[PDB]
RNA sequence: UACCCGCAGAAGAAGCACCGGCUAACUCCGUGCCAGCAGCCGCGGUAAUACGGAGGGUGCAAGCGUUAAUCGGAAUUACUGGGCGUAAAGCGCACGCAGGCGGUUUGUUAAGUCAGAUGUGAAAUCCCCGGGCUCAACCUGGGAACUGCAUCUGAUACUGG
RNA sequence: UUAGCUAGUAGGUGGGGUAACGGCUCACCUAGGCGACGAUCCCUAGCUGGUCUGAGAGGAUGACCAGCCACACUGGAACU
């Protein structure tokens, strides 16, 4: 408050930390699936939600969500991950990008296709 | 302890006029006489007087219009903890020029309007609305 | 040594040249001591395609500056027109 | 670059004549102008203030035919120019070569005028120009080039423009197929139906 | 004559032995332009009834402000509860740079050119209070001169 | 006409040399309070004539030692 | 090469994301806390404008979304511009060094302060007024600015000595 | 959640050395010098004109272009 106190000790600017530290300010990262499994969400929801533990190229290991109906992922499968948490899955801070490396696009989807990695129906 | 007798004078004005006092009395001082003179010239007070030889008192007669204080506000700006000086090109305009700032220029205590006309800066004592 | 020369300051296929005084060791577009004028090869006939401060050029030559062949040509051109 | 869909749906959504068709016939014989498009368009909404501002921004773009990027560039320049940002913006939109060509009467529609420009049929100040966004300026002459005067289109367009209100800032000599900026346009002459200040509000947020 | 604005509608509730009773409140403002404005806060069990009460309250409870040919005389700071409002005059063609709750008040007052900023609580009721308080404090050269006894040439 | 500083002697224990404190008031860049700032110079003190607390006038010269690059012009006041 | 002329024929050239609220756009059919969705609030357990499909919108456009990252909004580190009875915040109390601050009067100085002059503050970039590319983006002439630094010559109200 | 650091270290006299002033270097003499206005130590980092953001004060930043600095497989040295 008092200007003499400020001169003795300036205003310490807070630092806002990144929510996605394993991404190291990269937009995406490659990684290898060491385990693929499912978990219940927390209240109020109920489901079995599909997740994988992935070792990233920088040696971080993270848990990542596998969006869309059905997937082809397996252990030793190589996938690309991006930021964005899932809420109701505590600790799942990343999304697997569909349609990149081993991760197939969703097979029969026709709307919002570019989010799920599936190509135009030509006919 | 008392360390800013100018802020003391201004606070006595503010409080006395909020209390509808007819006149207020305070310890006199050259700078107080100068500031009171400027306020009288700008019409913010009716009159001022100095009385006594060893311990001179200064009295200000306060001014009211339609039953309400003529002084709208009176605010110390330069103060012992943080002195404020302005260049000619930086003198502030109080209430877009309806109020006054009191500036101790090298030529003496005067309004900011006078200081701009003279082409001077100085120490800015207070704002009066 | 001190030299007076053109610096290419324009766009692709749209050249424009400043006339600048420089130490010859400095890069074409790099450090220069003083700017002296300009030349435009594609200015209109209605347009000022060249300007020089001939007085300061004479001053620098008095100091021993080396004029570039194209700058010399431009000076002859200006003193033929003017 | 261009909107190429059903033009009169736009007028239905705006609920007003956007001049998108040349006017050989009244639009109520060509569309259910009073009713918004689609199966739910019968249920008239209660627009929010954001909806209102958006709808005006859309209306002005959709009259003059300008996409958002170019329209925002017009906004930024009008905000740089002196005077009222909205009056400046409308003066800019009215200074376009396609708009001038339409006001002059050589195109029966703004899109027809845009073809006439783009196909190098228009000359300005004695020079061919085919850029729709070209900003015409005072004392500029505009004319049909002499190879193009053979088209029937321009003749029918002139026989329609004679029915429309005559602009005050232009002059045209229809029989010669030439005209001129006598003045720049002004807020007095452009239709009061455009709420320029809502455009200013929407981009100034 | 009067222009009218509806600023807000809010559903409040009273708990009772049987459950919850829901009631609607409406905040509105009216003004002549030309620097006369008032605000009205109405309560009812029906939205239109609340609005009508608000308007009737706002036709009385109406104050005069000495506008400077459609702008403010000087910058003003108004405060009420948690809401602090700064307003400043602006050059012609500036328009109303303000938030919705302040824009309504300044529009119905007819202040065409203003810069304004809300600080602290943006709660519409207290914001309207703070804005009216500020406009009510604003004063003009002629009555400043009358107070100080100078001629207006003092400006 | 010499561009010159004035300060006070804060050490005299070196040979032909003194430490001079220059004391300056400077407006703090951000908070605007006027802060006292100090700078210490090592100054050539020929004859060892100065003493602690003296007020002395000094000027910039050629390098004279590792630290010394300033020389005494004159004493202006003396302590005690 | 730019630019210009001639010729055939609408011929060779439109996608992406949204539509529960914030925030413009909604109705059927699947499905039944499942499968799935999400920036925040939050949707789905047999009548889902929130999932998936279709028909309608709406918004951008040779682009459209998503992830990463900075400032803003954030007066949420508050110098301009915040707080400390109960929301986070007065040391358990006191003494006291360095430090910050200083009742009143006269003289003197001219450090802070103020005024004037001179030098410097590279060009570019950024603003204003004008030129050139068929417009624009680009290029370019002149001006302003470069919120500063430094050295002289004055003023002495205030502050410091 | 680094408080003490330094012995060519700080200064002086006289030789030597440099294009040149100097502990730059050497013999001897004095015993200092720096530091809470943060020395020493640890982590990070080329600097500036500027760029982005902002009503402004500020905050972040130093890709392209221009000025200065440093480097040239790693570590030393000198020659012309
Ligand atoms: K503060
Ligand atoms: K020696
Ligand atoms: K040494
Ligand atoms: Mg449940
Ligand atoms: Mg484009
Ligand atoms: Mg708040
Ligand atoms: Mg939604
Ligand atoms: Mg259903
Ligand atoms: Mg922020
Ligand atoms: Mg801030
Ligand atoms: Mg707080
Ligand atoms: Mg408690
Ligand atoms: Mg507490
Ligand atoms: Mg206590
Ligand atoms: Mg005590
Ligand atoms: Mg003490
Ligand atoms: Mg003390
Ligand atoms: Mg005193
Ligand atoms: Mg001085
Ligand atoms: Mg050598
Ligand atoms: Mg590095
Ligand atoms: Mg801000
Ligand atoms: Mg800016
Ligand atoms: Mg590089
Ligand atoms: Mg290598």
Curated annotation (Swiss-Prot), chain A:
GO MF term list: misfolded RNA binding; rRNA binding; structural constituent of ribosome; tRNA binding
InterPro entries referenced in this protein's UniProt entry, alphabetically: NA-bd_OB-fold, Ribosomal_uS12, Ribosomal_uS12_bac
Query: Cross-referenced Gene3D superfamilies, in alphabetical order?
Result: Nucleic acid-binding proteins (2.40.50.140)
Among its keywords, does the record have Ribonucleoprotein?
yes
What quaternary structure, including any partners, is listed in this protein's UniProt entry? Part of the 30S ribosomal subunit. Contacts proteins S8 and S17. Interacts with ArfA. May interact with IF1 in the 30S initiation complex.
- Give the UniProt family note: Belongs to the universal ribosomal protein uS12 family.
Q: What is this protein called?
A: Small ribosomal subunit protein uS12
* Species this protein is from: Escherichia coli (strain K12)
Swiss-Prot record, chain B:
Q: Name one GO biological process term.
A: regulation of translation
Write the record's keywords in alphabetical order, separated by commas.
Repressor, Ribonucleoprotein, Ribosomal protein, RNA-binding, rRNA-binding, Translation regulation
Q: Name one GO cellular component term.
A: cytoplasm
Could you confirm whether the keyword rRNA-binding appears in this record?
Answer: yes
What molecular function does GO assign, one term?
Answer: rRNA binding
**Which domain of life does the UniProt lineage start with?**
Bacteria
Q: List the InterPro entries hit by this protein, alphabetically.
A: Ribosomal_uS8, Ribosomal_uS8_CS, Ribosomal_uS8_sf
Instruction: Describe, as the record does, how this protein assembles with itself and its partners.
Output: Part of the 30S ribosomal subunit. Contacts proteins S5 and S12.
Family the entry assigns = Belongs to the universal ribosomal protein uS8 family.
Q: What does this protein do?
A: One of the primary rRNA binding proteins, it binds directly to 16S rRNA central domain where it helps coordinate assembly of the platform of the 30S subunit.
Q: Kindly give the PANTHER family that the UniProt entry links to this protein.
A: 40S RIBOSOMAL PROTEIN S15A (PTHR11758)
| Name used for this protein in its record | Small ribosomal subunit protein uS8
This protein's species is Escherichia coli (strain K12)
Q: What lineage does UniProt assign to this protein's organism? A: Bacteria, Pseudomonadati, Pseudomonadota, Gammaproteobacteria, Enterobacterales
Per the record, the gene is rpsH
UniProtKB/Swiss-Prot annotation, chain D:
Name all S4 RNA-binding domain ranges.
Answer: 95-155
Which family, according to UniProt?
A: Belongs to the universal ribosomal protein uS4 family.
A Gene Ontology BP annotation from the UniProt entry: ribosomal small subunit biogenesis
Q: What is this protein called?
A: Small ribosomal subunit protein uS4
Swiss-Prot/TrEMBL keywords: Antibiotic resistance, Repressor, Ribonucleoprotein, Ribosomal protein, Ribosome biogenesis, RNA-binding, rRNA-binding, Transcription, Transcription antitermination, Transcription regulation, Transcription termination, Translation regulation
A cellular component term, taken from the record's GO annotations: small ribosomal subunit
Gene label: rpsD
Q: Name one Pfam family in it.
A: Ribosomal_S4
What is said about its interaction partners and assembly? Answer: Part of the 30S ribosomal subunit. Contacts protein S5. With proteins S3 and S5 encircles the mRNA as it enters the ribosome, which may play a role in mRNA helicase processivity. Some nascent polypeptide chains are able to cross-link to this protein in situ. The rRNA transcription and antitermination complex (rrnTAC) consists of RNAP, NusA, NusB, NusE (rpsJ), NusG, SubB, ribosomal protein S4, DNA and precursor rRNA; S4 is more flexible than other subunits.
Gene Ontology molecular function: any one = mRNA regulatory element binding translation repressor activity
Matches recorded under PANTHER family: 30S 40S RIBOSOMAL PROTEIN, SMALL RIBOSOMAL SUBUNIT PROTEIN US4M
UniProt cross-references to InterPro entries, sorted A to Z: Ribosomal_uS4, Ribosomal_uS4_bac-type, Ribosomal_uS4_CS, Ribosomal_uS4_N, S4_RNA-bd, S4_RNA-bd_sf
UniProtKB/Swiss-Prot annotation, chain E:
PANTHER family xrefs: MITOCHONDRIAL RIBOSOMAL PROTEIN S5
Molecular-function annotations in GO: rRNA binding; structural constituent of ribosome
What this protein is reported to do is described as: With uS4 and uS12 plays an important role in translational accuracy. Many suppressors of streptomycin-dependent mutants of protein uS12 are found in this protein, some but not all of which decrease translational accuracy (ram, ribosomal ambiguity mutations).
Q: Which residues form the S5 DRBM domain?
A: 2-65
Result of changing residue 103 to S: In strain: NEA-319; neamycin resistant
Query: PROSITE patterns given for it?
Result: RIBOSOMAL_S5, S5_DSRBD
What's said on domains? Answer: The N-terminal domain interacts with the head of the 30S subunit; the C-terminal domain interacts with the body and contacts protein uS4. The interaction surface between uS4 and uS5 is involved in control of translational fidelity.
Arranged from A to Z, the UniProt key words for this protein are:
Acetylation, Antibiotic resistance, Ribonucleoprotein, Ribosomal protein, RNA-binding, rRNA-binding
Name one cellular component (GO) term: cytosol
Q: What is this protein called?
A: Small ribosomal subunit protein uS5
The cross-references to SUPFAM superfamilies, in alphabetical order and at most eight, read: dsRNA-binding domain-like, Ribosomal protein S5 domain 2-like
Q: Which gene encodes it?
A: rpsE
């Amino acid at each position: 408050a008092t200007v003499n106190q400020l001169v003795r000790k300036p205003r310490a600017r807070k630092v806002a930390k990144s929510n996605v530290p394993a991404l190291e300010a990269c937009p995406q990262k490659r990684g290898v699936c060491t385990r693929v499994y499912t978990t219940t969400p927390k209240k109020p929801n109920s489901a079995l939600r599909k997740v994988c533990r992935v070792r990233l190229t920088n040696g971080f290991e993270v848990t990542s969500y596998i969006g869309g109906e059905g997937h082809n992922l397996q252990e030793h499968s190589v996938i690309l991950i991006r930021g964005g948490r899932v809420k109701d899955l505590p600790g799942v801070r990343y999304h697997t990008v569909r349609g990149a490396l081993d991760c197939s696009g969703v097979k029969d989807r026709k709307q919002a296709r570019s989010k799920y990695g599936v190509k135009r129906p030509k006919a | 302890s008392m360390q800013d007798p100018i802020a003391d004078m201004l606070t006595r004005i503010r409080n006395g006029q909020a209390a509808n006092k007819a006149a207020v009395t305070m310890p006199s001082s050259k700078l107080k006489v100068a500031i009171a003179n400027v306020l009288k010239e700008e019409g913010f007070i009716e009159d001022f007087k100095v009385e006594g030889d060893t311990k001179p008192e200064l009295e200000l007669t306060l001014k009211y219009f339609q039953g309400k204080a003529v002084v709208e506000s009176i605010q110390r700006v330069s103060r012992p903890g943080l002195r404020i000086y302005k260049r000619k090109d930086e003198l502030p305009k109080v209430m877009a020029g309806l109020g006054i700032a009191v500036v101790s220029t090298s030529k003496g205590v005067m309004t900011d309007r006078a200081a701009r006309q003279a082409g001077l800066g100085g120490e800015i004592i207070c704002y009066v609305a | 040594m001190v030299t007076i020369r053109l610096a290419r300051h324009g766009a692709k296929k749209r050249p424009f040249y400043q006339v600048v005084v420089a130490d010859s060791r400095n890069a074409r577009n790099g450090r220069f001591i003083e700017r002296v004028g300009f030349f435009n090869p594609i200015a209109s006939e209605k347009e000022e395609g060249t300007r020089l401060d001939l007085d300061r050029i004479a001053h620098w030559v008095g100091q021993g500056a080396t004029i570039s062949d194209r700058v010399a040509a431009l000076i002859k051109e200006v003193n033929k027109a003017a | 670059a261009r909107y190429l869909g059903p033009k009169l749906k736009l007028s239905r959504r705006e609920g007003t004549d956007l001049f998108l068709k040349s006017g050989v016939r009244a639009i109520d014989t060509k569309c259910k102008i009073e009713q918004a498009p689609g199966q739910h368009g019968a249920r008239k909404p209660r627009l929010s203030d954001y909806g209102v501002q958006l709808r005006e921004k859309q209306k002005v773009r959709r009259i003059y035919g300008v996409l958002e990027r170019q329209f925002r560039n017009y906004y930024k320049e009008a905000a740089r120019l002196k005077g009222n940002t909205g009056e400046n913006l409308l003066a800019l939109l009215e200074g376009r070569l396609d708009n001038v060509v339409y006001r002059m009467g050589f195109g029966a529609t703004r899109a027809e005028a845009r073809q006439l420009v783009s196909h190098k049929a228009i000359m300005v100040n004695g020079r061919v120009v085919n850029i729709a966004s070209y900003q015409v300026s005072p004392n500029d002459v505009v004319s049909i080039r002499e190879k193009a005067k053979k088209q029937s289109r321009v003749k029918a367009a002139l026989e329609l423009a004679e029915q429309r209100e005559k602009p005050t800032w232009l002059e045209v000599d229809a029989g010669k197929m030439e005209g001129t900026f006598k003045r720049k346009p002004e807020r007095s002459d452009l239709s009061a139906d455009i709420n320029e200040h809502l455009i200013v509000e929407l981009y100034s947020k | 004559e009067l222009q009218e604005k509806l600023i807000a509608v809010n559903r409040v509730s009273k708990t009772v032995k049987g459950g919850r009773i829901f009631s609607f409140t409406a905040l509105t403002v009216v003004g002549d332009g030309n620097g006369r404005v008032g605000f009205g806060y109405g309560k009812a069990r029906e939205v239109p009834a609340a609005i009508q009460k608000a308007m009737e309250k706002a036709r009385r409870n109406m104050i005069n402000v000495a506008l400077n040919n459609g702008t403010l005389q000087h910058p003003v700071k108004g405060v009420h509860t948690g809401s602090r409002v700064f307003m400043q005059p602006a050059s012609e063609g500036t328009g109303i740079i303000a938030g919705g709750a302040m824009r309504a008040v300044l529009e119905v007052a007819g202040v065409h050119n203003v810069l304004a900023k809300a600080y602290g609580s943006t709660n519409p009721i207290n914001v309207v209070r703070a804005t009216i308080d500020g406009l009510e404090n604003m004063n003009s050269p002629e009555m400043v001169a009358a107070k100080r006894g100078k001629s207006v040439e003092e400006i | 006409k010499i561009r010159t500083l004035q300060g006070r002697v804060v050490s005299d224990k070196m040979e032909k040399s003194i430490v001079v404190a220059i004391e300056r008031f400077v407006k703090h860049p951000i908070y605007g309070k006027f802060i006292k700032r100090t700078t210490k110079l090592h100054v050539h003190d020929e004859n060892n004539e100065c003493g602690i607390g003296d007020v002395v006038e000094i000027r910039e010269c050629r390098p004279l030692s590792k630290t010394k690059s300033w020389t005494l012009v004159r004493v202006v006041e003396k302590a005690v």
